[PDB]
Amino acid sequence: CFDFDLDNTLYFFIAGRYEYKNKGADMFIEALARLNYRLKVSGSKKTVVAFIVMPAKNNSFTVEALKGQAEVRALENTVHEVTTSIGKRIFDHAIRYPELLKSSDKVMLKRRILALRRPEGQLPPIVTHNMVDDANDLILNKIRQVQLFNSPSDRVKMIFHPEFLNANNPILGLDYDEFVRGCHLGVFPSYYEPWGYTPAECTVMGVPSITTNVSGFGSYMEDL
Amino acid sequence: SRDLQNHLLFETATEVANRVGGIYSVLKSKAPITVAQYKDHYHLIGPLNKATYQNEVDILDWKKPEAFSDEMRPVQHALQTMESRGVHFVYGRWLIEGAPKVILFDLDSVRGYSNEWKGDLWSLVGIPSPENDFETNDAILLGYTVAWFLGEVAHLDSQHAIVAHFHEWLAGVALPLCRKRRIDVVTIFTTHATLLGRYLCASGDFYNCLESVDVDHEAGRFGIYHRYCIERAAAHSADVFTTVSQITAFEAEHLLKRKPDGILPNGLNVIKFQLHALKKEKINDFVRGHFHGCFDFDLDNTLYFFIAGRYEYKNKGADMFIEALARLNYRLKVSGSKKTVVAFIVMPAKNNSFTVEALKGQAEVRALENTVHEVTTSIGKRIFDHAIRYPELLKSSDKVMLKRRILALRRPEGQLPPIVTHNMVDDANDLILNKIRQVQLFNSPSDRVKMIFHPEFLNANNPILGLDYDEFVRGCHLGVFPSYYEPWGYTPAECTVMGVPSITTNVSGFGSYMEDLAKDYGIYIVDRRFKAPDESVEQLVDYMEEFVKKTAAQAINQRNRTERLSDLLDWKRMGLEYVKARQLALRRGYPDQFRELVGEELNDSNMDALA
Amino acid sequence: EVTTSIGKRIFDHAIRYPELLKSSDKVMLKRRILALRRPEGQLPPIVTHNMVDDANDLILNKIRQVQL
Ligand SMILES: O=c1ccn([C@@H]2O[C@H](COP(=O)(O)OP(=O)(O)O)[C@@H](O)[C@H]2O)c(=O)[nH]1
Ligand SMILES: O=c1ccn([C@@H]2O[C@H](COP(=O)(O)OP(=O)(O)O)[C@@H](O)[C@H]2O)c(=O)[nH]1
């Protein structure tokens, strides 16, 4: 259910130690729910996918989330195989001078497309892991309270990844520094934060960011 | 009078378009070869699985006049007729290589006739049917429907002879009906195992005293009677009765009480596989991350052994494997050997992903690799820039980060490399861990065979072991599959196709089959059927030892030899056994018409007796 | 080649815990450096090609006239 234009979507992210109130996770999730409303009303063309990278007690990846990446990768391979077959066929014809997809290829293509179908009415998850307390976790419950559930109607999508980032992840193959750079806007709505290295290192890496005036780094930044 | 020459093929099994068994694999990989031969005369039939069919089946409109050649009309009208009476089904292509046409009956649209049918069955074949057994309810439903559909085809089609193949007891209720109603189709029943075989071996003796067990009583003892009756009825009603393996055929003869007319060994789509150095290196990379902080052996002088597959401790022969390795340890310490064997058990178990310990391992060893690289390329630039300008290279800076990365490898005194890569959800009761404890293979440097249990299938995206299973297999030196109950054994056979030496048994179907075609070819066969439990084990250790003491050139000899065996196992050769089977079914069905087509009268007691 | 040898040597030492250039390497290094020496007082050319008219070409003759 991939219904939006990646050439027209922005990636927002909040990250760091899991302090719900103090890092300002609450405000973040809440403000996003509101940015959803405004973008449906303003009938906007764009899409915001927003990551919460904050470590929580977990049991590694959800079977759902892993199948996701797997099938989509197998699509990539099969497409590639198929295209390079077309390549050889197209070239070999030209060099000799004086439907390019055989049945064979149509089949394994059709199969890889069918594997993407997801069980009717099942939406993209809001969490990438097996949460060890799915009922009491502050972050999930707030993103439920605001009903950001990733239905196609929703213009801001919600991804909670309760685990630091490592390039070797089945799901998201980046280190944290890699990931930060690949995003569009860091958001760190902190309430108690004597300095805040997350936003400051966000800035050093050349990414736009939102902090507060109760953040140390905010405080400092304000005077420039 | 019908055309034996150009005939119709309907292969029926529970698995058609849904992985539930291993038969799925058999049929899926046999499709390409049989579609090639029979084109659109060939249909697979099975129960529709409303949960998965949409991922595996190109649904087709079977009503368009275009859907069938004119000579194939009958089948269309047959379905037409079937719809009339209110039977629902999916016509479609099964999206595999081959893309064979598939008929998937909707068992719900017929679940009404259930009581009437359970009855009719009892009073034609005396097959009991408790109502709490859903598999047999479905097996009966499927049976009556398919028999029905063949009734119709045999009725409407008058040009082609009709052969109908059924795999395993669940798809086997149709068989009695066909013989009873004297429907005009010749029938083949293949069994990929027996019911009693499985149930007897599930406790821990068989191949000896199996020729002398009271079938009717043991089937009872297990609460299996009605299932057993179907499997038996299936085997006697069929015109041709077969099994996948020589070994299973002996089991079948005494347990179902009919001698198989032939064997239908499972081949593979060999092209779908076809390096070793390239992949061995990925395994080296894992072994270094794992034994970090006490890496005391020469990788240029270590061999990788592996057992893999479904987690059946007794039947896959995990026990013998671990045990025999403990013994291969002894022998290698005494014989004071220079070499090291690291042995993987890739068998899926209940787990909580990776152990912190095991993940730190790979992480720190990777950070070493980076730092070394960064450092060396710095030396590079420095060396070059000096030369190009003409007329301790490690600065302090580099020494520091080098020293730190080396220090991170130190492991807490007396802590050994783990025997398991995952968080086991039952560390105390798991059969594999407890056996590798009982034998005290704990990976101390004294130990010459190291033990790695990886309770999880292999995927290239693993933090620990960055291979797919095919990649991993190739990177190893010897597969070891000491199986005790194993009607075929795809794990060893695909091991061989990939050009890796392997050890199987003579109670393995694949073993059984392989025996008839010695060890120089990369296939060792342990005798598990005649020698006693212990001599078996010992024979195993002798085989491993011999392998360890092979020279660099002796090993490259074997490997090159097994690699040529591969083409023997493709369907292109193994498929010919199915042709023998189908044609024996015809020769038995139309003894007269067959004589005309051949020019004489050929023997009809085996499939080998025929050709 | 030489550096990646150093690489392997440095790493293998560390992984096992508990002048990196052998003679072998010094030699082929020394030889490659010596091959750069150019015949005394011979300067870097002002032209990369074999000119079919080295005497009349406008471009060469101007860059001679200015003695670059
Ligand atoms: O996936 C991640 C996310 C966090 N970080 C690091 O972990 C620290 C956690 O941020 P925290 O909020 O605790 O720092 P603060 O901003 O409060 O100083 C950051 O400095 C990041 O450099 C990381 O290494 N990987
Ligand atoms: O990590 C793994 C381990 C095994 N397999 C596959 O699983 C099968 C295991 O065979 P199984 O034991 O289930 O059946 P049998 O050995 O009796 O044929 C092999 O065919 C492999 O192709 C896999 O894909 N990934």
From Swiss-Prot, chain A:
Q: What is this protein called?
A: Glycogen [starch] synthase isoform 2
Compartments reported by the entry: Cytoplasm, Cytosol
| Changes after translation | Phosphorylated by the cyclin-CDK PCL10-PHO85. Phosphorylation causes inactivation of enzyme.
Q: What does this protein do?
A: Glycogen synthase participates in the glycogen biosynthetic process along with glycogenin and glycogen branching enzyme. Extends the primer composed of a few glucose units formed by glycogenin by adding new glucose units to it. In this context, glycogen synthase transfers the glycosyl residue from UDP-Glc to the non-reducing end of alpha-1,4-glucan.
Q: What binding partners and quaternary form does the record give?
A: Interacts with PCL10.
Organism the protein comes from: Saccharomyces cerevisiae (strain ATCC 204508 / S288c)
Residues bearing PTM Phosphoserine: 60, 151
Residues bound to UDP are 17, 198
Where alpha-D-glucose 6-phosphate is bound, by residue? 184
Instruction: Give the residues the record marks as binding UDP-alpha-D-glucose.
Output: 17, 193, 195-196
Q: What else is known?
A: Present with 14600 molecules/cell in log phase SD medium.
